[PDB]
Amino acid sequence: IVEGSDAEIGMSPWQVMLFRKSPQELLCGASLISDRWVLTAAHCLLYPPWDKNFTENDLLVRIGKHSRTRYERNIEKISMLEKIYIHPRYNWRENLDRDIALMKLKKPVAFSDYIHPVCLPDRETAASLLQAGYKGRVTGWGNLKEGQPSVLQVVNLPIVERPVCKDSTRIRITDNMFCAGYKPDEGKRGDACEGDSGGPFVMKSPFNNRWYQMGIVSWGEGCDRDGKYGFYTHVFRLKKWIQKVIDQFGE
């Protein structure tokens, strides 16, 4: 996160850490969607251009975290995965189109003050909130500058109208994506960066006072660049896939 600030304690209790067993390093962010289900960017697991192809045995999930680096002794929960699911049509070849995957925890997690799930949007919640100008909030332990934070970082960014999204890049933008950031004229900055991937883009509904996950941190060009924007997988458009997997495999 660039130009963000320290998260308060318990501010984002769905925030997960994707952590490699050995070497020990932070793969990505992620989010807790129920007691045995974590949502992330498919590209944090599968990215053939970089030779990344992680399996269940490769990783750990760290929930309840605040500190990037410390083992948060009676706070964080660490889990093992039973199964990994990547969208069947995820596009790693040209644009990270669908960039979404689900991870099934080996055993359900017990909720606490620091560990709580986020809601998934319904057609109606999406329709009224995913609007240009509406701000959402991103969180992660990634680079601070296009450098690694001590605690969880947070930033509030406004959704940008499609056209502006399209006109900022040479990459083909699909409907499964949206972009967020301030305009150069706007005189407020911030963005996600390298290491924030797979974390949540969240909005608080004004109707029922609940937190909803709208986006997943996907990609960008550099971080916090004037006239550029971060790109996020549009969670609502991929919901049927999500339901599909949970219904065939869990809950």
């Binding site: 308060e8 304690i9 318990g10 501010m11 209790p13 969607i33 129920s34 909720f111 606490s112 003050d113 620091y114 709580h116 799930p117 986020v118 809601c119 998934l120 909130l129 100008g133 509406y134 701000k135 959402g136 909030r137 947070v154 509030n156 406004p158 909005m203 608080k204 509904s205 004004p206 006072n209 609940r210 937190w211 909803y212």
Partner: peptide, 29 residues
């Protein structure tokens, strides 16, 4: 659950507000 999803134990549940959530709500026009 996800029956209590999006309600943070240390904030919504106690009726406390985080330091910048109002910037969100205020943007919802």
């Amino acid at each position: 659950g996800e029956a209590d999803c999006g309600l943070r134990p240390l904030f919504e549940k106690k009726s406390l507000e985080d330091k910048t959530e109002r910037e969100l709500l205020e943007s919802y026009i």
